[PDB]
Structure formats: structure tokens, C-alpha cells
Symmetry: D2
Subunit: 155 residues, 4 copies
């Protein structure tokens, strides 16, 4: 009669043995979510950590790329510097060389003059010789003219 409760008690026992199997499955799925979130955010943090070292390299490459441009800078200035001096020397050389071509032609000009002056001293001596021969002949004349006039009488 009253043991109709006994059917209820096993039926009610069927829920509390069920609510437990059910709660434990939901709780083992929520636990499975917050677990995955742990494992990932871990591997994400380590991956995001790579960024600072990658930015280091980029900054160095950036710096090394600057050093390069400053070395190219130094080179242009050098070249232009040592070219300008090379040019100034080139002109001094030139100036010098034009000066030498002048003194050489002034010595060729002198060599030719020495010649006209040497030649005319030869000519001057030959003149003296010529006048010495003419003198000799003249004296041989005045001499024999005194001898011719050493006569007396007659005829």
C-alpha cells in the first residue's frame, strides 16, 4: 500500500545518479575548455616573444645600412678631395712644362745667334788676310818704285 513510495524512491534515485553523471560531464567539458585556453595562450606567448628579437635584427640592419651610407659619404668626399689636388698638381706640372719649352727655345734662339756671330768672325779674319795680301803687294810696289828712281843720266 504505502510501499508505492518504494517505486518513487528508486525513481528519485535514478535522477541523482543521473544528475551526477551529467554534471560531471559538463564539468569535464568546461574543464576541457579552460584547459585548452591554457595550453594555447602558453604557445602564443612564446610565439609573440619572438618579436623583440626580430626587431633587434631589423634595427641592426637598419643601423648597418646607415653605416654603409656614411661610408659611401666618406668615399665621395675623399675622391673629390684627392681629385682636386691631382688637378692642381696637373696644372703646376703643365705650367712648369710650358716654362721649360720657353727656355729651350730661348737657347735655340741663342745657338743660332752664336752662329751668325761665329761666322762673321771667320769672315772678319778672311777680310784681314785679304787686306794683308793687298798691303803686301802695295809695299812691293812703292819699294821697286824707289829702286827705279835710283837712276842718273842719260835716259
Amino acid at each position: 500500500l504505502q510501499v508505492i513510495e518504494e517505486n518513487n524512491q528508486r525513481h528519485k534515485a535514478m535522477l541523482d545518479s543521473m544528475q551526477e553523471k551529467f554534471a560531471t560531464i559538463i564539468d569535464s567539458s568546461l574543464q576541457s575548455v579552460e584547459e585548452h585556453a591554457k595550453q594555447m595562450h602558453k604557445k602564443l606567448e612564446q610565439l609573440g616573444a619572438m618579436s623583440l628579437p626580430d626587431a633587434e635584427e631589423l634595427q641592426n640592419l637598419q643601423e648597418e645600412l646607415a653605416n654603409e651610407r656614411a661610408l659611401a659619404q666618406q668615399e665621395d668626399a675623399l675622391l673629390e678631395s684627392m681629385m682636386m689636388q691631382m688637378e692642381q698638381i696637373k696644372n703646376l706640372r703643365s705650367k712648369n712644362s710650358i716654362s721649360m719649352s720657353v727656355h729651350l727655345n730661348k737657347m735655340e734662339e741663342s745657338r743660332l745667334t752664336r752662329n751668325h756671330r761665329i761666322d762673321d768672325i771667320k769672315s772678319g779674319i778672311q777680310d784681314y788676310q785679304k787686306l794683308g795680301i793687298e798691303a803686301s803687294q802695295s809695299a812691293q810696289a812703292e819699294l821697286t818704285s824707289q829702286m827705279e828712281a835710283g837712276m842718273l843720266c842719260l835716259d
Copy 2:
């Protein structure tokens, strides 16, 4: 008689008219020598005068030939100077460039690592998915096992 002196007087007159023609010829030949010596030593002095100007030119050429050697001197020093600096720049460039080849390979080394780390997060999610499917099947089981046990009597 005594006029035999008259022959002597004309004879003596023949000498003094002769000594004169003769002295005058010697004296006109000595005069002709010391005259030539005058005309020559004149042209010799002017010729010998050329020597100082010729020595001037030689001294200048000597000087200009010295300037040249000092310009060649300046050039060697210049070249060697601007070469040495060119060399130092060459090395700095090199050093820089070797440094860049290092940072580039450290970024390729990082790119490959990023990949292994990206791939395994994909693999980690597929794992989570796989475990989520296995969980779902497991729960469908424990569920229907509670339903199967909702029977009574008989059999």
C-alpha cells in the same frame, strides 16, 4: 871739282825719301795689326757676354726640373695617402656587409622557427577538435546508458 858732293847730296836725298816711304809702310802695318786686335777683341767680348744669359736659362731649366720632381713627390704621397684611406673604407664596408649577412641569416633562422611553431598550433587545435569529438561520443554513451537502466520488471 868740289861739286862731286852734289852727287852725294842727291844720293843721300835718295835715302831720306826712302826711309820715309819705308817707315810709313811699317808703321801702316803695325797700325794695321793693333787695329785688327781692336776689331776682334770687340766682337769677342760681345760673344763672351752671351754666356751669362745662357747660364741663366740653364739655371732656370735646372730649377724647373726640380719643381717637377717635387711635384712628382707630392703626387706619390697623395696617391698613397688617398689609397690607404680607400682601403680602410673598403674594409669597413666589408665588415659592415659581413655583419648584414649575419643578421639576414638570423632572420631566416627565425622565419623557419616561426613556421614550426605555427604548424604545431594548428596541430594542437586539430588535437583539441579530435578530443572534442571523442568527448561528444563518450557523453552520448553515458547518457543512453542511464536511459537503458530506466527499466523495471520483468526482463
Copy 3:
């Protein structure tokens, strides 16, 4: 009292039916939940896979850049060699010109020395000619006075008897 039992039977059958209606009611509801937590999982998996592909897809361009960068480094190294060879080949031409220029300056100093020596010799040979004149006009003066002797001698001596 035979009906007194059919009363208990109809309420024990009622309680069982009432109990089964909710027994089905929660099971269907629960199978909805586990089938919803799976969809919530597979959706997030799709959600993440989309972003992980988009992120992993950056690898090729990053590699493009490094490759382009790496070869541009080679360009520089080429330019270095070229510059090197240019300066070296300039250094060597400059060496030879230097020598030639040197050799040439010596040859000029030698010709200059020759002309200074030639100038010197030319002066002493001019000196000799100046000397040759003062020698000559000396013998010239001495010849005339020596002849005026022998002239005026035999004039003075030729007048009358002399010994």
C-alpha cells in the same frame, strides 16, 4: 475490495507515465547540450584555423624579402670587387707612369749637365782666342820695332864707312 487494488494500479501507472515523460524530456534536452558544446568546439576550431592560415601565410613574403635582401648583398659584393679592380688597375698604371716620368727627368738633367759643361768649355775656348790676339799684337809690336831697328840701322850705317 477487488477495486481497491485497481485504484493503486491506476496511480502507480500514472506515476510511471508521468516519470517517463520527463525522463524523455531531459534526455532529449541533454543530447541537445552535448551536441551544442561540440558545435561550439568545432566552430572555434574553424575560427582559429582561419586566422592561423592567414598568419602562416606571411612566411612566403618574409622569405621573399630575405631573398631579395640576400641577393642585394651580393650586388654590393660585386660592386666591391669592381671598385677594387678599378683602383688596383689604376694603381698599376700610375706606377708605370711614375717610373717613365722619373726615367725621363734624369735624361733631362743629363742633357742639362751636358749643356752646362758645353757652356763652360765654350768659354775657355773663347778665352784662348782673346789670349791669341794679345799674343799676336805683342809679336806684332815687337816685329815692327825690331824692323825699325834693322831699317834705321843700315840707314845710319849705310852713309859712309862703318864697322
Copy 4:
């Protein structure tokens, strides 16, 4: 007194002969002197001509030197041109290398900028994935508590008559 004249004749013939002997004597002697002063002249002329030839003979070597000197000046001018051309052609190669090097450094800065921009973007896409998780586990927590409601709800409600 006929002989007194032959006395004067023999002494006037004597005086004339004596006078002629010396007349020849000085003329021969004088023709020796004028013939000696000419030899003294022609000898000095030979004497000078020898020295003037030896002196004038220096002209050719002096000219040799100037010519050798003049062409050595041309050697220098050649070397100048060569050096000029060498430096000019070096200046121009150096100009091009400079440009290439320049152009190259820009291309590298561009690839670097790209990678700094690529790095930035890659971080924010990583940020989103971190965000996507905290979104997910939020919806995860909220889903569980919402289901524990509907679970414990119909357990509590499914015991006996409820409305």
C-alpha cells in the same frame, strides 16, 4: 892735267858703286821684311781659323741636346695625357659604381621597411588570436553555467508538479 880728271872719274865711279852695293843690300833686306810681315799675318789667320772651327763645331752637339731635350718634353706631355685619361676614366667608373651602390641601398631600406611593417602586422594578428581565446573561454564558462541552470532546473522542477 888730263890725268887729274881720271882721278875724279875713278872716285866718282867708286862712290856710285859703293852706293849701289848698299842700295841693293837694303832693298833685298826690305823685301824680306814685307814678305815676313805677310807670313806673320797669314800664319795668325791659319791660327785663328783652326780655333774658330773648333769653337763653331760645338753648335751641332748643343743642337743635339736641345732636340733631345725638346722631345723629352713631348714624352712628358704624353705621360700627362695618359695620366689624365686614366684618372678621368677612373672618375667615371667610380661615378657609376656610386649610383649603383646608392640605388642598391635604397632597395634594401625598402625591403627592411617591408619587414618592419610585416613584423608589426604579424604581431597584431597574434594579438587577435590571444583575444579569440579569451573570447572563447568566456563563452565556454558562460555556456556551462547556462547549461547547469537548465540541468539543475528540470531536476528540481521534475520532482513533482511545478509551474
